[PDB]
Amino acid sequence: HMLELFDVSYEELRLGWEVICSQGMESDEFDGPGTRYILGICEGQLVCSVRFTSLDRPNMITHTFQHCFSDVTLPAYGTESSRFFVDKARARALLGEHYPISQVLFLAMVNWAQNNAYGNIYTIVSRAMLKILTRSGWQIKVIKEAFLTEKERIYLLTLPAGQDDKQQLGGDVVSRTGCPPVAVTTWPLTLPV
């Protein structure tokens, strides 16, 4: 058993490779050149993933939810993660139950961010996702709470990707999975499940 987290550009996107794709999020307006993805693969299958888009290219903050956050100043340089995906049922079956695939992808996100020159990451999450990010210990920053609907609250967040954040999620995954300490410091990531 082994867990691989690494990134691929849209530009890069045999049997197992289509199994992965057959398990991926069906595209949208923001899936094109420039867009990168982090894929979590265990025994030839997609267990989790997340998408990264440049802040200056069209994205969910600048377009989809324009009316919601047009009052927030956005840096010229940056990345927005989205389509945070985790298949809990498949992770359990491959990485055993109680495995923190969620905390791992967060770690993969910080590590990928450092490897690509991003101090932090901008994202739009749902109330629930916010609850999880909060519980993860990751020192996220709500830039603005907005109302999608009458009761639907969504948030614009900055996810810290400094060394402290990396070590913090790393140490978390360690004492949690008991995996080798150096295994959470690299990019790409590779975890013994």
Coordinates of N, CA, C and O in Angstrom, one line a residue:
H1 N 0.8 -1.2 0.0 CA 0.0 0.0 0.0 C 0.9 1.3 0.0 O 1.8 1.4 0.8
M2 N 0.5 2.2 -0.9 CA 1.3 3.4 -1.0 C 0.5 4.6 -1.6 O -0.3 4.4 -2.6
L3 N 0.7 5.8 -1.1 CA -0.1 7.0 -1.5 C 0.8 8.0 -2.2 O 1.7 8.6 -1.6
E4 N 0.5 8.3 -3.5 CA 1.2 9.3 -4.3 C 0.4 10.6 -4.5 O -0.7 10.5 -5.0
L5 N 1.0 11.7 -4.2 CA 0.4 13.0 -4.4 C 1.4 13.8 -5.3 O 2.6 14.0 -4.9
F6 N 1.0 14.3 -6.4 CA 1.9 15.0 -7.3 C 1.0 15.9 -8.2 O -0.2 15.7 -8.2
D7 N 1.6 16.8 -9.0 CA 0.8 17.6 -9.8 C 1.0 17.4 -11.3 O 2.1 16.9 -11.7
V8 N 0.0 17.7 -12.1 CA 0.1 17.6 -13.5 C -0.7 18.8 -14.1 O -1.7 19.3 -13.5
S9 N -0.2 19.3 -15.2 CA -0.8 20.5 -15.8 C -1.9 20.0 -16.7 O -1.9 18.8 -17.1
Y10 N -2.8 20.8 -17.1 CA -3.9 20.5 -18.0 C -3.2 20.0 -19.3 O -3.6 19.0 -19.9
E11 N -2.1 20.7 -19.7 CA -1.4 20.4 -20.9 C -0.9 19.0 -20.9 O -0.7 18.4 -22.0
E12 N -0.6 18.4 -19.7 CA -0.2 17.0 -19.6 C -1.4 16.1 -19.6 O -1.3 14.9 -20.0
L13 N -2.6 16.7 -19.2 CA -3.8 15.9 -19.2 C -4.5 16.0 -20.5 O -4.0 15.6 -21.6
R14 N -1.4 3.0 -18.3 CA -2.3 3.3 -19.5 C -3.7 3.0 -19.1 O -4.6 3.9 -19.4
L15 N -4.0 1.8 -18.6 CA -5.3 1.4 -18.2 C -5.7 2.2 -16.9 O -6.8 2.7 -16.8
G16 N -4.8 2.2 -16.0 CA -5.0 2.9 -14.7 C -5.1 4.4 -14.9 O -5.8 5.0 -14.0
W17 N -4.5 4.9 -15.9 CA -4.6 6.4 -16.1 C -6.0 6.9 -16.5 O -6.4 8.0 -16.1
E18 N -6.7 6.0 -17.2 CA -8.1 6.4 -17.6 C -9.0 6.1 -16.4 O -10.1 6.6 -16.3
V19 N -8.6 5.2 -15.5 CA -9.5 4.8 -14.4 C -9.5 6.0 -13.5 O -10.5 6.4 -13.0
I20 N -8.3 6.7 -13.4 CA -8.2 7.9 -12.7 C -9.1 9.0 -13.3 O -10.0 9.5 -12.6
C21 N -8.9 9.2 -14.6 CA -9.7 10.2 -15.3 C -11.2 9.9 -15.1 O -12.0 10.8 -14.9
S22 N -11.6 8.6 -15.2 CA -13.0 8.2 -15.1 C -13.5 8.4 -13.6 O -14.6 8.1 -13.3
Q23 N -12.6 8.9 -12.8 CA -13.0 9.2 -11.4 C -12.8 10.7 -11.1 O -12.9 11.1 -9.9
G24 N -12.4 11.4 -12.1 CA -12.2 12.9 -11.9 C -13.4 13.8 -12.1 O -14.4 13.4 -12.7
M25 N -13.3 15.0 -11.6 CA -14.4 16.0 -11.7 C -14.6 16.4 -13.2 O -13.6 16.8 -13.8
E26 N -15.8 16.3 -13.7 CA -16.0 16.7 -15.1 C -15.7 18.2 -15.2 O -16.3 19.0 -14.4
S27 N -14.9 18.5 -16.2 CA -14.4 19.9 -16.4 C -15.5 21.0 -16.3 O -16.7 20.8 -16.2
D28 N -15.0 22.2 -16.3 CA -15.8 23.5 -16.3 C -14.9 24.5 -17.1 O -13.9 24.2 -17.6
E29 N -15.5 25.7 -17.1 CA -14.8 26.8 -17.8 C -13.3 27.0 -17.5 O -12.6 27.5 -18.3
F30 N -12.9 26.7 -16.2 CA -11.6 26.9 -15.8 C -10.6 25.8 -16.0 O -9.5 25.8 -15.5
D31 N -10.9 24.7 -16.8 CA -10.0 23.6 -17.0 C -9.4 23.8 -18.4 O -10.0 23.4 -19.4
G32 N -8.3 24.4 -18.5 CA -7.6 24.6 -19.7 C -6.1 24.9 -19.4 O -5.7 24.9 -18.3
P33 N -5.3 25.2 -20.4 CA -3.8 25.5 -20.2 C -3.6 26.4 -19.0 O -4.4 27.4 -18.8
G34 N -2.6 26.2 -18.3 CA -2.3 27.1 -17.1 C -2.8 26.4 -15.8 O -2.1 26.5 -14.8
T35 N -3.9 25.8 -15.9 CA -4.5 25.1 -14.8 C -3.7 23.8 -14.4 O -3.4 23.0 -15.3
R36 N -3.4 23.7 -13.1 CA -2.7 22.6 -12.7 C -3.5 21.8 -11.7 O -4.5 22.3 -11.2
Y37 N -3.2 20.5 -11.5 CA -3.9 19.7 -10.6 C -3.0 18.8 -9.7 O -1.9 18.5 -10.1
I38 N -3.4 18.5 -8.5 CA -2.7 17.7 -7.6 C -3.6 16.4 -7.6 O -4.8 16.5 -7.3
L39 N -3.0 15.3 -7.8 CA -3.7 14.0 -7.8 C -3.1 13.1 -6.7 O -1.9 12.9 -6.6
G40 N -4.0 12.5 -6.0 CA -3.6 11.5 -4.9 C -4.0 10.2 -5.4 O -5.2 9.8 -5.6
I41 N -3.0 9.3 -5.7 CA -3.2 8.0 -6.2 C -2.7 6.8 -5.4 O -1.5 6.8 -5.0
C42 N -3.5 5.9 -5.2 CA -3.2 4.7 -4.4 C -3.6 3.4 -5.2 O -4.8 3.2 -5.5
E43 N -2.6 2.6 -5.5 CA -2.8 1.4 -6.3 C -3.6 1.6 -7.6 O -4.6 1.0 -7.8
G44 N -3.1 2.6 -8.4 CA -3.7 2.9 -9.6 C -5.0 3.6 -9.6 O -5.7 3.8 -10.6
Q45 N -5.5 4.1 -8.4 CA -6.7 4.9 -8.3 C -6.7 6.3 -7.7 O -5.9 6.6 -6.8
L46 N -7.6 7.1 -8.2 CA -7.7 8.5 -7.7 C -8.5 8.5 -6.4 O -9.7 8.2 -6.3
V47 N -7.8 8.9 -5.3 CA -8.4 9.0 -4.0 C -8.8 10.4 -3.6 O -9.6 10.6 -2.8
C48 N -8.0 11.4 -4.2 CA -8.3 12.8 -3.9 C -7.6 13.7 -4.9 O -6.8 13.2 -5.7
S49 N -8.0 14.9 -4.9 CA -7.4 15.9 -5.8 C -7.9 17.3 -5.6 O -8.9 17.5 -4.9
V50 N -7.2 18.2 -6.2 CA -7.6 19.6 -6.1 C -7.0 20.3 -7.3 O -6.0 19.9 -7.9
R51 N -7.7 21.4 -7.6 CA -7.2 22.2 -8.8 C -6.7 23.6 -8.5 O -7.2 24.3 -7.6
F52 N -5.6 23.9 -9.2 CA -5.0 25.3 -9.0 C -5.1 26.1 -10.3 O -4.9 25.6 -11.4
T53 N -5.6 27.3 -10.1 CA -5.7 28.3 -11.2 C -5.0 29.6 -10.8 O -5.1 30.0 -9.7
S54 N -4.3 30.2 -11.8 CA -3.6 31.5 -11.5 C -4.7 32.6 -11.2 O -5.7 32.6 -11.9
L55 N -4.4 33.5 -10.3 CA -5.3 34.6 -10.0 C -5.5 35.5 -11.1 O -6.6 36.1 -11.2
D56 N -4.6 35.7 -12.0 CA -4.8 36.6 -13.1 C -5.5 36.0 -14.3 O -6.0 36.7 -15.2
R57 N -5.7 34.6 -14.3 CA -6.4 34.0 -15.4 C -7.8 33.9 -14.8 O -8.1 34.1 -13.6
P58 N -8.8 33.7 -15.7 CA -10.2 33.7 -15.2 C -10.4 32.6 -14.2 O -9.8 31.5 -14.3
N59 N -11.1 32.8 -13.1 CA -11.3 31.8 -12.1 C -12.6 32.0 -11.3 O -13.4 32.9 -11.6
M60 N -12.9 31.1 -10.4 CA -14.1 31.2 -9.6 C -14.3 32.4 -8.8 O -15.5 32.8 -8.5
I61 N -13.2 33.0 -8.3 CA -13.3 34.2 -7.5 C -13.6 35.5 -8.4 O -14.5 36.3 -8.1
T62 N -12.9 35.5 -9.5 CA -13.1 36.7 -10.4 C -14.3 36.6 -11.3 O -14.8 37.6 -11.8
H63 N -14.8 35.3 -11.6 CA -16.0 35.2 -12.5 C -17.2 34.5 -11.8 O -18.2 35.2 -11.5
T64 N -17.1 33.3 -11.5 CA -18.3 32.6 -10.9 C -18.9 33.4 -9.7 O -20.1 33.6 -9.7
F65 N -18.1 33.8 -8.8 CA -18.6 34.5 -7.6 C -18.1 36.0 -7.6 O -17.8 36.5 -6.5
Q66 N -18.2 36.6 -8.8 CA -17.8 38.0 -9.0 C -18.6 38.9 -8.0 O -18.1 39.7 -7.3
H67 N -19.9 38.7 -8.1 CA -20.8 39.6 -7.3 C -20.6 39.4 -5.8 O -20.8 40.4 -5.1
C68 N -20.1 38.3 -5.4 CA -19.8 38.1 -4.0 C -18.5 38.7 -3.4 O -18.6 39.2 -2.3
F69 N -17.4 38.6 -4.1 CA -16.2 39.1 -3.6 C -15.5 40.2 -4.4 O -14.3 40.4 -4.2
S70 N -16.2 41.0 -5.2 CA -15.7 42.1 -6.0 C -15.2 43.2 -5.1 O -14.6 44.2 -5.6
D71 N -15.3 43.1 -3.8 CA -14.9 44.2 -2.9 C -13.6 43.8 -2.2 O -13.2 44.5 -1.3
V72 N -13.0 42.7 -2.6 CA -11.8 42.2 -2.0 C -10.6 42.4 -2.9 O -10.6 42.1 -4.1
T73 N -9.5 43.1 -2.4 CA -8.3 43.3 -3.2 C -7.6 42.0 -3.5 O -7.2 41.3 -2.5
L74 N -7.3 41.7 -4.7 CA -6.6 40.5 -5.0 C -5.2 40.8 -5.6 O -5.1 41.7 -6.5
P75 N -4.2 40.1 -5.1 CA -2.8 40.3 -5.6 C -2.8 40.0 -7.0 O -3.7 39.4 -7.6
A76 N -1.7 40.5 -7.7 CA -1.5 40.3 -9.1 C -1.0 38.8 -9.4 O -1.3 38.2 -10.4
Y77 N -0.2 38.4 -8.4 CA 0.4 37.0 -8.5 C -0.2 36.1 -7.4 O -0.3 36.5 -6.2
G78 N -0.6 34.9 -7.8 CA -1.2 34.0 -6.9 C -2.0 32.9 -7.5 O -2.1 32.7 -8.7
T79 N -2.4 32.0 -6.6 CA -3.1 30.8 -7.1 C -4.4 30.6 -6.3 O -4.6 31.0 -5.1
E80 N -5.4 30.1 -7.0 CA -6.7 29.8 -6.4 C -6.9 28.3 -6.5 O -6.8 27.7 -7.6
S81 N -7.1 27.6 -5.4 CA -7.4 26.2 -5.4 C -8.9 26.0 -5.5 O -9.6 26.9 -5.1
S82 N -9.4 24.9 -6.1 CA -10.8 24.7 -6.2 C -11.0 23.3 -6.4 O -10.1 22.5 -6.7
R83 N -12.3 22.9 -6.4 CA -12.7 21.5 -6.7 C -11.9 20.5 -5.8 O -11.4 19.5 -6.2
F84 N -11.9 20.9 -4.5 CA -11.2 20.1 -3.6 C -12.0 18.8 -3.5 O -13.2 18.7 -3.2
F85 N -11.3 17.7 -4.0 CA -11.9 16.4 -4.0 C -11.3 15.4 -3.2 O -10.1 15.2 -3.3
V86 N -12.1 14.6 -2.5 CA -11.7 13.5 -1.7 C -12.7 12.4 -1.8 O -13.9 12.7 -1.4
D87 N -12.4 11.2 -2.2 CA -13.4 10.1 -2.2 C -13.2 9.4 -0.9 O -12.3 8.5 -0.8
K88 N -14.0 9.7 0.1 CA -13.9 9.0 1.4 C -14.1 7.5 1.3 O -13.3 6.7 1.9
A89 N -15.0 7.1 0.5 CA -15.3 5.6 0.3 C -14.1 4.9 -0.2 O -13.7 3.8 0.3
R90 N -13.5 5.4 -1.3 CA -12.3 4.8 -1.9 C -11.1 4.9 -1.0 O -10.3 3.9 -0.9
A91 N -10.9 6.0 -0.3 CA -9.7 6.1 0.5 C -9.7 5.1 1.6 O -8.7 4.4 1.8
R92 N -10.9 4.9 2.2 CA -11.1 3.9 3.3 C -10.7 2.5 2.8 O -9.9 1.8 3.4
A93 N -11.2 2.2 1.6 CA -10.9 0.8 1.0 C -9.5 0.6 0.7 O -9.0 -0.5 0.6
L94 N -8.7 1.7 0.4 CA -7.4 1.5 0.0 C -6.3 1.9 1.1 O -5.3 1.3 1.2
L95 N -6.6 3.0 1.8 CA -5.7 3.5 2.8 C -6.2 3.1 4.2 O -5.7 3.6 5.2
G96 N -7.2 2.2 4.3 CA -7.7 1.8 5.5 C -8.5 2.9 6.2 O -8.4 4.1 5.8
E97 N -9.4 2.5 7.1 CA -10.2 3.5 7.8 C -9.4 4.4 8.8 O -8.4 3.9 9.3
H98 N -9.9 5.6 9.0 CA -9.2 6.6 9.9 C -8.0 7.3 9.3 O -7.5 8.2 9.9
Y99 N -7.6 6.9 8.1 CA -6.5 7.6 7.4 C -6.9 9.0 7.1 O -8.0 9.3 6.6
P100 N -6.1 10.0 7.5 CA -6.4 11.4 7.2 C -6.1 11.9 5.9 O -5.3 12.9 5.7
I101 N -6.7 11.3 4.8 CA -6.4 11.7 3.5 C -6.6 13.2 3.3 O -6.0 13.9 2.5
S102 N -7.6 13.8 4.1 CA -7.9 15.2 4.0 C -6.7 16.1 4.5 O -6.3 17.0 3.8
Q103 N -6.1 15.7 5.6 CA -5.0 16.5 6.1 C -3.8 16.3 5.2 O -3.0 17.2 5.1
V104 N -3.7 15.2 4.5 CA -2.6 14.9 3.6 C -2.7 15.8 2.4 O -1.7 16.4 2.0
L105 N -3.8 15.9 1.7 CA -4.0 16.8 0.6 C -3.7 18.2 0.9 O -3.2 18.9 0.1
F106 N -4.0 18.6 2.2 CA -3.7 20.0 2.6 C -2.2 20.1 2.7 O -1.7 21.2 2.3
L107 N -1.5 19.1 3.1 CA -0.1 19.1 3.2 C 0.5 19.1 1.8 O 1.5 19.8 1.5
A108 N -0.1 18.3 0.9 CA 0.3 18.3 -0.5 C 0.2 19.7 -1.1 O 1.0 20.1 -1.9
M109 N -0.9 20.4 -0.7 CA -1.2 21.7 -1.2 C -0.1 22.7 -0.8 O 0.3 23.6 -1.6
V110 N 0.3 22.7 0.5 CA 1.3 23.6 1.0 C 2.6 23.2 0.3 O 3.3 24.1 -0.2
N111 N 3.0 22.0 0.2 CA 4.3 21.5 -0.4 C 4.3 21.9 -1.9 O 5.4 22.2 -2.4
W112 N 3.2 21.8 -2.6 CA 3.2 22.1 -4.0 C 3.3 23.6 -4.1 O 3.9 24.2 -5.0
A113 N 2.7 24.3 -3.2 CA 2.7 25.8 -3.2 C 4.1 26.3 -3.1 O 4.5 27.2 -3.8
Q114 N 4.9 25.7 -2.1 CA 6.2 26.2 -1.9 C 7.1 25.9 -3.1 O 7.9 26.7 -3.5
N115 N 6.8 24.7 -3.7 CA 7.5 24.3 -4.9 C 7.2 25.2 -6.2 O 7.9 25.1 -7.2
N116 N 6.2 26.0 -6.1 CA 5.8 26.8 -7.2 C 5.7 28.3 -6.9 O 5.2 29.1 -7.7
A117 N 6.3 28.7 -5.8 CA 6.4 30.1 -5.4 C 5.1 30.8 -5.0 O 4.8 31.9 -5.5
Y118 N 4.4 30.2 -4.0 CA 3.2 30.8 -3.5 C 3.2 30.7 -2.0 O 3.3 29.7 -1.4
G119 N 3.3 31.9 -1.4 CA 3.3 32.0 0.0 C 2.0 31.5 0.6 O 2.0 30.8 1.7
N120 N 0.9 31.8 0.0 CA -0.4 31.3 0.5 C -1.3 31.0 -0.7 O -0.9 31.2 -1.9
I121 N -2.5 30.4 -0.4 CA -3.4 30.0 -1.4 C -4.8 30.6 -1.2 O -5.4 30.5 -0.1
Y122 N -5.4 31.2 -2.2 CA -6.7 31.7 -2.1 C -7.7 30.6 -2.5 O -7.5 29.9 -3.5
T123 N -8.9 30.6 -1.9 CA -9.9 29.6 -2.2 C -11.3 30.0 -1.7 O -11.4 30.9 -0.8
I124 N -12.3 29.4 -2.3 CA -13.7 29.7 -2.0 C -14.2 28.4 -1.4 O -14.2 27.4 -2.1
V125 N -14.6 28.3 -0.2 CA -15.1 27.1 0.4 C -16.6 27.2 0.9 O -17.1 28.3 1.1
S126 N -17.2 26.0 1.2 CA -18.5 26.0 1.8 C -18.4 26.0 3.3 O -17.3 25.7 3.8
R127 N -19.5 26.2 3.9 CA -19.5 26.3 5.4 C -18.8 25.0 5.9 O -17.8 25.1 6.7
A128 N -19.2 23.8 5.5 CA -18.6 22.6 5.9 C -17.1 22.5 5.7 O -16.4 22.1 6.6
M129 N -16.7 22.8 4.4 CA -15.3 22.8 4.2 C -14.6 23.7 5.1 O -13.5 23.4 5.7
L130 N -15.2 24.9 5.4 CA -14.6 25.8 6.4 C -14.5 25.1 7.7 O -13.5 25.3 8.4
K131 N -15.5 24.4 8.1 CA -15.5 23.7 9.4 C -14.3 22.7 9.5 O -13.5 22.7 10.4
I132 N -14.0 22.0 8.4 CA -12.9 21.0 8.3 C -11.6 21.8 8.3 O -10.7 21.4 9.1
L133 N -11.4 22.8 7.5 CA -10.1 23.5 7.4 C -9.8 24.1 8.8 O -8.6 24.1 9.2
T134 N -10.8 24.5 9.5 CA -10.6 25.1 10.8 C -10.2 24.0 11.8 O -9.2 24.1 12.5
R135 N -10.9 22.8 11.8 CA -10.5 21.7 12.6 C -9.1 21.1 12.3 O -8.5 20.5 13.2
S136 N -8.6 21.3 11.1 CA -7.4 20.7 10.7 C -6.2 21.4 11.3 O -5.1 20.9 11.3
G137 N -6.4 22.6 12.0 CA -5.3 23.3 12.6 C -4.6 24.2 11.7 O -4.0 25.2 12.1
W138 N -4.8 24.0 10.4 CA -4.2 24.9 9.4 C -4.7 26.3 9.7 O -5.9 26.5 9.9
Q139 N -3.8 27.3 9.8 CA -4.1 28.7 10.1 C -4.7 29.5 9.0 O -4.1 30.6 8.7
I140 N -5.8 29.1 8.4 CA -6.4 29.7 7.3 C -6.9 31.1 7.7 O -7.1 31.4 8.9
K141 N -7.2 31.9 6.7 CA -7.7 33.3 7.0 C -9.0 33.6 6.2 O -8.9 33.7 5.0
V142 N -10.1 33.8 6.9 CA -11.3 34.1 6.2 C -11.2 35.6 5.8 O -11.0 36.5 6.6
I143 N -11.2 35.9 4.5 CA -11.1 37.2 4.0 C -12.5 37.8 3.9 O -12.8 39.0 4.1
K144 N -13.5 36.9 3.6 CA -14.9 37.4 3.6 C -15.9 36.3 3.5 O -15.8 35.3 2.8
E145 N -16.9 36.4 4.4 CA -18.0 35.4 4.4 C -19.1 36.0 3.5 O -19.3 37.2 3.5
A146 N -19.6 35.2 2.6 CA -20.7 35.7 1.7 C -21.8 34.8 1.7 O -21.8 33.7 2.2
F147 N -23.0 35.3 1.2 CA -24.1 34.5 1.2 C -24.4 34.1 -0.3 O -24.8 34.9 -1.1
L148 N -24.3 32.8 -0.6 CA -24.5 32.3 -1.9 C -26.0 32.4 -2.0 O -26.6 33.1 -2.9
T149 N -26.8 31.8 -1.1 CA -28.2 31.8 -1.1 C -28.7 32.5 0.2 O -28.0 33.4 0.8
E150 N -29.9 32.1 0.6 CA -30.5 32.7 1.9 C -29.7 32.1 3.1 O -29.4 32.9 4.0
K151 N -29.5 30.8 3.0 CA -28.8 30.1 4.1 C -27.4 29.5 3.7 O -26.7 29.0 4.5
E152 N -27.1 29.7 2.4 CA -25.8 29.1 1.9 C -24.7 30.1 2.1 O -24.6 31.1 1.4
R153 N -23.8 29.8 3.1 CA -22.7 30.7 3.3 C -21.4 30.1 2.7 O -21.2 28.8 2.8
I154 N -20.7 30.9 2.0 CA -19.4 30.5 1.4 C -18.4 31.5 1.9 O -18.7 32.6 2.3
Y155 N -17.1 31.1 1.8 CA -16.1 32.0 2.3 C -14.9 32.1 1.4 O -14.5 31.1 0.7
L156 N -14.2 33.2 1.4 CA -13.0 33.5 0.6 C -11.9 33.3 1.7 O -11.9 34.0 2.7
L157 N -11.0 32.4 1.4 CA -9.9 32.2 2.4 C -8.6 32.3 1.8 O -8.4 32.1 0.6
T158 N -7.6 32.5 2.6 CA -6.2 32.5 2.2 C -5.7 31.3 3.1 O -6.1 31.2 4.2
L159 N -5.0 30.4 2.5 CA -4.4 29.3 3.2 C -2.9 29.5 3.2 O -2.3 29.6 2.2
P160 N -2.4 29.6 4.5 CA -1.0 29.9 4.7 C -0.1 28.7 4.2 O -0.4 27.6 4.5
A161 N 0.9 29.0 3.4 CA 1.8 28.0 2.9 C 3.3 28.3 3.3 O 4.2 28.0 2.5
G162 N 3.5 28.8 4.5 CA 4.9 29.1 4.9 C 5.4 27.8 5.6 O 4.7 26.8 5.7
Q163 N 6.7 27.9 6.0 CA 7.4 26.8 6.6 C 6.6 26.3 7.9 O 6.6 25.1 8.1
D164 N 6.1 27.2 8.6 CA 5.4 26.9 9.8 C 4.1 26.0 9.5 O 3.8 25.1 10.2
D165 N 3.4 26.4 8.4 CA 2.2 25.7 8.0 C 2.6 24.3 7.5 O 1.9 23.4 7.8
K166 N 3.7 24.3 6.8 CA 4.2 23.0 6.3 C 4.5 22.0 7.4 O 4.0 20.9 7.5
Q167 N 5.3 22.5 8.4 CA 5.7 21.7 9.5 C 4.5 21.3 10.4 O 4.3 20.2 10.8
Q168 N 3.5 22.3 10.5 CA 2.3 22.1 11.3 C 1.5 20.9 10.7 O 1.0 20.1 11.4
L169 N 1.2 21.0 9.4 CA 0.4 19.9 8.8 C 1.2 18.6 8.7 O 0.7 17.5 8.8
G170 N 2.5 18.8 8.5 CA 3.4 17.7 8.4 C 3.5 16.9 9.7 O 3.3 15.7 9.7
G171 N 3.7 17.6 10.8 CA 3.8 16.9 12.1 C 2.4 16.3 12.5 O 2.4 15.3 13.2
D172 N 1.4 16.9 12.0 CA 0.0 16.4 12.2 C -0.1 15.1 11.5 O -0.5 14.1 12.2
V173 N 0.2 15.0 10.3 CA 0.1 13.8 9.5 C 1.1 12.7 10.1 O 0.8 11.5 10.0
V174 N 2.2 13.1 10.6 CA 3.1 12.1 11.2 C 2.6 11.4 12.4 O 2.3 10.2 12.4
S175 N 2.5 12.1 13.5 CA 2.0 11.5 14.7 C 0.6 10.8 14.5 O 0.1 10.1 15.3
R176 N 0.0 11.2 13.4 CA -1.3 10.6 13.0 C -1.2 9.3 12.2 O -2.0 8.4 12.4
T177 N -0.3 9.3 11.3 CA -0.1 8.1 10.4 C 1.2 7.3 10.9 O 1.3 6.2 10.5
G178 N 2.0 8.0 11.6 CA 3.2 7.4 12.1 C 4.2 7.1 11.0 O 5.1 6.2 11.1
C179 N 4.0 7.8 9.9 CA 4.9 7.6 8.7 C 6.2 8.2 9.0 O 6.4 9.0 9.9
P180 N 7.3 7.9 8.2 CA 8.6 8.5 8.3 C 8.5 10.0 8.3 O 7.8 10.6 7.5
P181 N 9.2 10.7 9.2 CA 9.2 12.2 9.3 C 9.6 12.9 8.1 O 9.2 14.0 7.8
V182 N 10.5 12.3 7.3 CA 11.0 13.0 6.0 C 10.0 12.9 4.9 O 10.1 13.6 3.9
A183 N 9.1 11.9 5.0 CA 8.1 11.7 4.0 C 7.1 12.8 3.8 O 6.4 12.9 2.8
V184 N 7.0 13.7 4.8 CA 6.0 14.8 4.7 C 6.7 16.1 4.4 O 6.0 17.1 4.4
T185 N 8.0 16.0 4.1 CA 8.7 17.3 3.8 C 8.9 17.5 2.3 O 9.4 18.5 1.9
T186 N 8.6 16.5 1.5 CA 8.9 16.5 0.1 C 7.8 16.8 -0.9 O 6.6 16.9 -0.5
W187 N 8.2 17.1 -2.1 CA 7.2 17.3 -3.2 C 7.9 16.9 -4.5 O 8.9 17.5 -4.9
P188 N 7.2 15.9 -5.2 CA 6.0 15.2 -4.9 C 6.0 14.5 -3.5 O 7.1 14.3 -2.9
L189 N 4.9 14.1 -3.1 CA 4.7 13.4 -1.8 C 4.5 11.9 -2.1 O 4.0 11.5 -3.1
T190 N 4.9 11.1 -1.1 CA 4.8 9.7 -1.1 C 4.6 9.2 0.3 O 5.5 9.3 1.1
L191 N 3.4 8.6 0.6 CA 3.2 8.1 1.9 C 2.9 6.6 2.0 O 2.2 6.1 1.1
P192 N 3.5 6.0 3.0 CA 3.3 4.5 3.2 C 2.0 4.3 3.9 O 1.8 4.6 5.0
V193 N 1.1 3.6 3.2 CA -0.2 3.3 3.8 C -0.3 1.9 4.1 O -0.9 1.6 5.2

